[PDB]
């Protein structure tokens, strides 16, 4: 603009600069607005859409097809499609059913193989226990179950000669 150099998408905004102020600044000290020196109109600057790309795969041992997630961005501007609070999904078909979360997408969405379906994860099977101020439930039989849990207690003792 004058010496202010940067990259971003521009837009006129409602901010009211004083007559002498040339450009705005953010709380974190990043440029946040600019005054056009020809027509003196106040512009607003937003960073160009960037985000990380993730690959959702059921495993090569299962199938060589995957679904891709573009974090954060909007499907309208990505150069089956499904917009989510976590990002844009492509290659995964959204279904209204719910299931146990196979692998997590984010914001309550999970994906799993079937052809890669994306669904709102189920917290569990619902049931209402027949509560009453008068009735109690007692078990007439029992089962013995053996559960196994694994804990690490140590790790390889490595020494690196610094010199």
Ligand X SMILES: *[C@@H]1O[C@H](CO)[C@@H](O[C@@H]2O[C@H](CO)[C@@H](O)[C@H](O)[C@H]2NC(C)=O)[C@H](O)[C@H]1NC(C)=O
Ligand Y SMILES: *[C@@H]1O[C@H](CO)[C@@H](O)[C@H](O)[C@H]1NC(C)=O
Total binding residues toward ligand Y, as defined by CB under 6 A = 3
- What is the C-alpha separation between 55 and 111, in angstroms, rounded? 11
Out of 96, 132, 147, 159, name the contact with ligand Y by CB under 6 A. 96
Q: Does residue 145 bind ligand X (CB under 6 A)? A: no
Q: Which residue has the tokens 């998408």?
A: 9
* Cα dist from 14 to 24, 56, 137, whole Å: 12, 41, 65
Cβ neighbors of 42 (< 8 A, separation 6 or more) are 12, 13, 15, 16, 17, 33, 34, 35, 36
Out of 83, 94, 102, 117, name the contact with ligand X by CB under 6 A. 83
Total binding residues toward ligand X, as defined by CB under 6 A = 11
Residue 76 binds which entry of ligand Y, other proteins, ligand X, none, with Cβ cut-offs from 5 to 8 Å by kind? Answer: ligand X
Q: Which residues contact ligand X (rule: CB under 6 A)?
A: 16, 38-40, 74, 76, 83, 130, 133-134, 141
């Amino acid at each position: 603009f004058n010496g202010l150099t940067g990259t971003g998408v521009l837009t006129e905004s409602n901010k009211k600069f004083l007559p002498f102020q040339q450009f705005g600044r953010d709380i974190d000290d990043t440029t946040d607005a600019v005054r056009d020196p020809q027509t003196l109109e106040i512009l607003d600057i937003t960073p160009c859409s960037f985000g990380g790309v993730s690959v959702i795969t059921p495993g090569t041992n299962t199938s060589n097809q995957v679904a891709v997630l573009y974090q954060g961005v909007n499907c309208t501007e990505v150069p089956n499609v499904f917009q989510t609070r976590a990002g844009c999904l492509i290659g995964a078909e959204h279904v209204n059913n719910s299931y146990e979360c196979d692998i997590p997408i984010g914001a309550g969405i999970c994906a799993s193989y079937q052809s890669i379906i994306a669904y709102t994860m189920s917290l569990g099977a619902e049931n209402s226990v027949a509560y009453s101020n008068n009735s109690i439930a007692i078990p007439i039989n029992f089962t013995i179950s053996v559960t196994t849990e694994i804990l690490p207690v140590s790790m390889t003792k490595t020494s690196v000669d610094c010199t």
